[PDB]
Design a protein around this ligand. Structure first.
Ligand SMILES: Cn1ncc(-c2nc(N[C@H]3CC[C@H]([NH3+])CC3)ncc2F)c1CC1CC1
Lengths: 310, 252
C-alpha cells in the first residue's frame, strides 16, 4: 500500500522516555540523517472501539493550525507498519518550567522572569486570537528550548471556542491547582479567561518556586482561593448569584483579599505584585486579558525583559 | 505544500487509476458514484452538507494517490464519511455508519447478525480503511470549501435568495460532478459557481465604478477567459447529470 505523505517513524532513532502524564508515552529521538532532535508522542489507543480517536483528530487539527514562536511545533505525523500505530513528532525542547523552578540551583533575575511571562502571554494572545482554549495551563506544559524560547505544550484537552446563544463547554478541565473559580462553581460558558487564571498561578510560581494553591479536594481548592483572593460575594463578582453550586457548596464569607500581602516575601517588585492581582481576579469579566497584560507596566519598566541564559 | 493537493491536467490524466487501467471517463463515474453514495448515506445519517463535502474532498484526494482497482468506492466512502463526521464535529457511531452504508449498497438484503464473523469483519474493515485514508491524506483533514467564499461575494454584491442559494447548489455539484477541488483553489471555484449562477438566472453583476469586476474582490488571480472556460465545463456535466438542472430550472 503506497503512502507518500506519512513516513515511517523509524527515520527517527529513539533515545529515552522523557515524561509521564495523560499522554503517557513521550520519547526523545534523533533524525537518522541530520541528527535533528525531536520528541515522539504515541497516539493512545487503550481499547478504542470507534476507530481513530476523535480527541486525537482535535489535537492534530489544532497543532496544525497553531504555528507561532511561543507554541510547540508539530513537524509531522508518522506511522509504523501494517499487521498499526501513529506518532506525533515535535521540535524538541530541552526544559519545562516546573523542572527549572523545582531545581533549587537554577535562578531567575527579575529581567529574566519578565521575558518568560512576555513569551507566555504572547503565546496565549496567539491561541485565543485563533479561537482556541488551551484548558490545561500549568508549569509542566511550559517548555523552554535550549536558546531560551518559551513554548506552550500539551493541547490534549484543547478546543475551539465560539462567540455565541449561551455556550455549553466541558467543565472537568484544567489541573485542579490551576483551575479558575468559574469552573469550580460549575461554569459551562467560559472562554479565554480560564487560561489567564492559570498564567497568574504560573507567574506567582516563578517566585515561590512551588504551586501556590495546592488543594486536595475541589472544596479545599475553592476554600483556598477564598483565602488568597478574598471571598466570592456578588459585589466582587456581579451575578455570581445565578450559579447553582454557589448556594449548596460551602463558601467562606469573612475572607479579605490577601494576595499581595502573602506574595510580598517572594516577589519584591511592586508591578509584578499588581499584575498577579489582575490575573487572579475571581470575576472573569474583571480579569485582565492577554493583550492588556503585555501592555502592563511590568513589561515596560526597568529592568526590562532579557534573553534566557541563566 | 500549498500545491500538494492541486494538480495539472496531465497529472490527473496519468493518475493511479489510469496506471492500473481505468478509462478517463470511467474514472469520473467512480468519483461521481462515490459522491452520490456519500450524499445518500449522509442524508440518512443526518450530517450536514458540509460534512458530506469534506468527505467528497477526502475521496477525491484519496484517489489521486490510490487506485479504484485496489480500493472500491463502496469500501472507501463509508470510511471517508465516518472520518468527515468526526473531523466536522458530528460524529456518527461506527455501527450506525456500517448499518446505513449497508442499506444503501444492499437495499433488499437484511443486515448480518452483529454477533457474526461477517459483521465483526466488515466493522474492522471500516476501521482499517479509515487509517489508510488518514495516512494517504497525511492527516491534512482541514478542508476549505467554495461555499465559504460564496457568502463573501453574494451578500456583499447583493443578490436574492434565488441567486444566493443557486450558487451553493453549483458548489455542491462541483464536488459531485467535477475534479475542480483538485485543480482550482476554493475561492476560484466559488467564482465559477456564481458566474454560472448569474448565467442561469440572467443576472448581470455590474462593473464597479473603479473600472472593476466583482471577481477581483474574491480572488485577484481570476480572469474572464478562465470563468467562461470553467462555467462551460461545469454546465456540460450538469446537462449530462439527469434531473439535476430541473432543481434549479424556472417553470414560469
Ligand atoms: C507532553 N509533551 N508533548 C510534547 C512534549 C515535548 N517535550 C520536549 N522536551 C521535554 C524534555 C523533558 C522535560 N521534562 C519536558 C520537556 N520537547 C518537545 C515536545 F514536544 C511533551 C513533554 C513530555 C515530556 C513531558
Amino acid at each position: 500500500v503506497e503512502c507518500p505523505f506519512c513516513d515511517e517513524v523509524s527515520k527517527y532513532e529513539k533515545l529515552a522516555k522523557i515524561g509521564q502524564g495523560t499522554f503517557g508515552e513521550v520519547f526523545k529521538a534523533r533524525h537518522r540523517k541530520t541528527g535533528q532532535k525531536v520528541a515522539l508522542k504515541k497516539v493512545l489507543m487503550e481499547n478504542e472501539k470507534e476507530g481513530f480517536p476523535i480527541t486525537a483528530l482535535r489535537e492534530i487539527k489544532i497543532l496544525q493550525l497553531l504555528k507561532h514562536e511561543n507554541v510547540v511545533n508539530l513537524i509531522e505525523i508518522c506511522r509504523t507498519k501494517a499487521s498499526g500505530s501513529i506518532y506525533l513528532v515535535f521540535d524538541f525542547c530541552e526544559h519545562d518550567l516546573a523542572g527549572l523552578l523545582s531545581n533549587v540551583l537554577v535562578k531567575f533575575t527579575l529581567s529574566e522572569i519578565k521575558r518568560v511571562m512576555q513569551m507566555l502571554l504572547n503565546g496565549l494572545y496567539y491561541i485565543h486570537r485563533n479561537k482556541i482554549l488551551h484548558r490545561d495551563m500549568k508549569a509542566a506544559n511550559v517548555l523552554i528550548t535550549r536558546d531560551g524560547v518559551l513554548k506552550l505544550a500539551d493541547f490534549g484537552l484543547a478546543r475551539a471556542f465560539s462567540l455565541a446563544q449561551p455556550n455549553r463547554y466541558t467543565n472537568r478541565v484544567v489541573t485542579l491547582w490551576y483551575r479558575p473559580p468559574e469552573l469550580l462553581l460549575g461554569e459551562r460558558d467560559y472562554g479565554p479567561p480560564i487560561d489567564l487564571w492559570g498564567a497568574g498561578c504560573i507567574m506567582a510560581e516563578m517566585w515561590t518556586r512551588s504551586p501556590i494553591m495546592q488543594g486536595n479536594t475541589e472544596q479545599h481548592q475553592l476554600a483556598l482561593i477564598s483565602q488568597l483572593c478574598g471571598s466570592i460575594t456578588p459585589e466582587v463578582w456581579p451575578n455570581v448569584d445565578n450559579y447553582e453550586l454557589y448556594e449548596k457548596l460551602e463558601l467562606v464569607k469573612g475572607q479579605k483579599r490577601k494576595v499581595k500581602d502573602r506574595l510580598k516575601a517572594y516577589v519584591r517588585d511592586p508591578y509584578a505584585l499588581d499584575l498577579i492581582d489582575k490575573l487572579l481576579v475571581l470575576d472573569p469579566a474583571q480579569r485582565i486579558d492577554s493583550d492588556d497584560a503585555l501592555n502592563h507596566d511590568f513589561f515596560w519598566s526597568d529592568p526590562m525583559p532579557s534573553d534566557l541564559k541563566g | 505544500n500549498n500545491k500538494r493537493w492541486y494538480f495539472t491536467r496531465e497529472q490527473l490524466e496519468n493518475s493511479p487509476s489510469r496506471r492500473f487501467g481505468v478509462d478517463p471517463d470511467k474514472e469520473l463515474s467512480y468519483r461521481q458514484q462515490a459522491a452520490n453514495l456519500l450524499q445518500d448515506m449522509g442524508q440518512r445519517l443526518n450530517v450536514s452538507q458540509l460534512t458530506i463535502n469534506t468527505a467528497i474532498v477526502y475521496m477525491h484526494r484519496f484517489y489521486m494517490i490510490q487506485s479504484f482497482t485496489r480500493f472500491p468506492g463502496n469500501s472507501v466512502a463509508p470510511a471517508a464519511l465516518f472520518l468527515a463526521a468526526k473531523v466536522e464535529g458530528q460524529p456518527k457511531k461506527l455501527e450506525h455508519v456500517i448499518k446505513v452504508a449497508h442499506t444503501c449498497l444492499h437495499p433488499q438484503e437484511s443486515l448480518p447478525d452483529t454477533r457474526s464473523e461477517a459483521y465483526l469483519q466488515q466493522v474492522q474493515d471500516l476501521v482499517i480503511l479509515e487509517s489508510i485514508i488518514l495516512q494517504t491524506l497525511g492527516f491534512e483533514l482541514t478542508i476549505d470549501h467554495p461555499h465559504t467564499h460564496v457568502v463573501k461575494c453574494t451578500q456583499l454584491v447583493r443578490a436574492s435568495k434565488d441567486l444566493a442559494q443557486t450558487s451553493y447548489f453549483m458548489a455542491t455539484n462541483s464536488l459531485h460532478l467535477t475534479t475542480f477541488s483538485l485543480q482550482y483553489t476554493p475561492p476560484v471555484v466559488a467564482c465559477v459557481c456564481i458566474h454560472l449562477a448569474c448565467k442561469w438566472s440572467n443576472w448581470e453583476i455590474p462593473v464597479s465604478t473603479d473600472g472593476k469586476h466583482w471577481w477581483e474582490y474574491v480572488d485577484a488571480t481570476v480572469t474572464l477567459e478562465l470563468l467562461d472556460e470553467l462555467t462551460h465545463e461545469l454546465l456540460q456535466i450538469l446537462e449530462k447529470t439527469p434531473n439535476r438542472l430541473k432543481r434549479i430550472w424556472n417553470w414560469r
